[PDB]
Amino acid sequence: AKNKIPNSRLMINYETNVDGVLKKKELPYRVLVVGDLSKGRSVDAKKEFADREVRRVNNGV
Amino acid sequence: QPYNPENNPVQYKLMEGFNEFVDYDKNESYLWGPASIHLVKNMMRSYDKTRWFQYIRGVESGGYVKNLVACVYDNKGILETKSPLNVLFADYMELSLANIGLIPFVSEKGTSNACFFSVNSAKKVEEFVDGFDSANSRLIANLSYTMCISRISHYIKCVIRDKIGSIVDVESIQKILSDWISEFVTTVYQPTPLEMARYPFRNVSIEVKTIPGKPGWYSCKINVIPHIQFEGMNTTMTIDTRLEPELFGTNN
Numbered sequence: 001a002k003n004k005i006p007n008s009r010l011m012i013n014y015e016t017n018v019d020g021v022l023k024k025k026e027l028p029y030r031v032l033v034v035g036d037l038s039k040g041r042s043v044d045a046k047k048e049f050a051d052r053e054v055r056r057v058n059n060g061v
Numbered sequence: 062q063p064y065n066p067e068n069n070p071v072q073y074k075l076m077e078g079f080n081e082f083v084d085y086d087k088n089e090s091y092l093w094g095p096a097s098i099h100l101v102k103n104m105m106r107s108y109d110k111t112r113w114f115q116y117i118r119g120v121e122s123g124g125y126v127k128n129l130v131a132c133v134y135d136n137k138g139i140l141e142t143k144s145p146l147n148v149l150f151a152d153y154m155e156l157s158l159a160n161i162g163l164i165p166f167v168s169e170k171g172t173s174n175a176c177f178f179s180v181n182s183a184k185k186v187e188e189f190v191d192g193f194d195s196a197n198s199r200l201i202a203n204l205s206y207t208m209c210i211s212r213i214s215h216y217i218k219c220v221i222r223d224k225i226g227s228i229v230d231v232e233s234i235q236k237i238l239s240d241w242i243s244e245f246v247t248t249v250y251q252p253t254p255l256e257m258a259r260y261p262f263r264n265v266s267i268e269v270k271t272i273p274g275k276p277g278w279y280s281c282k283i284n285v286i287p288h289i290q291f292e293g294m295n296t297t298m299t300i301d302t303r304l305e306p307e308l309f310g311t312n313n
Contacts, residue, residue, distance in 0.1 A: 007153060008293075009155060009178070010296075015297050
């Protein structure tokens with residue numbers, strides 16, 4: 001409440017606020033490969049080059 | 062306490078059966094008395110024991126007022142006690158009254174007791190920018206000091222009357238008046254409150270000086286700083302984890 005509690009004679013509060021600059025997780029060294037894989041036969045290959053979402057191979061080939 | 066047979070029985074006579082005698086009350090209307098009594102009845106106490114009026118505030122120090130006339134009654138339950146005080150002031154009430162210039166007679170719930178936390182006059186407290194000025198008004202509003210400073214007036218216009226005709230000087234009146242009050246000024250603190258409340262004041266100046274024209278007349282000007290009482294405090298707790306870097310520091 002912004003109205004704030006009425007102050008007593010012995011108001012103890014306990015500060016729990018902490019400032020600081022957040023961390024940054026490392027960057028995985030990405031490796032792009034470009035070659036004719038589908039020969040023009042894939043969902044992302046049949047689409048225009050202006051919109052081809054790059055894959056990731058999170059799982060495996 | 063109103064009159065019941067099982068509670069506060071009327072002390073009958075040695076044959077006239079009277080102890081079986083009730084009264085008629087319920088909510089809140091059976092005789093009251095102003096807190097001012099116990100307030101003054103503590104100033105008296107704070108005089109026979111100590112000598113000045115520091116001993117009229119707080120629990121450990123002055124106003125405690127032990128053993129009050131509570132009340133109990135059996136409506137349907139089992140003797141539900143009734144707090145001795147008119148009103149059960151909370152904590153911030155004790156303070157939020159002191160600023161209005163009032164003296165709250167706060168009670169300890171169930172304990173059947175009380176205590177005067179604040180003893181302020183009706184004088185405005187002001188605020189001011191300059192710190193000194195702000196502190197002045199805080200001590201002047203405080204009744205307990207004006208009780209003490211008053212006791213110096215009862216010394217001057219009372220005792221110095223004896224040497225009204227004696228030949229005295231600027232340096233002699235500063236002696237008689239100071240040599241007295243000197244036994245009541247200290248800086249060191251004594252164990253326990255009572256053993257220290259013997260000393261109300263902290264330090265005093267007494268600069269008297271003769272005036273032109275009137276040869277046998279003078280004009281004093283004292284100034285007393287009383288031992289400032291506790292009044293409250295804020296507190297911020299926190300887990301620093303920077304105090305002992307030997308446990309959280311990089312180097313390990």
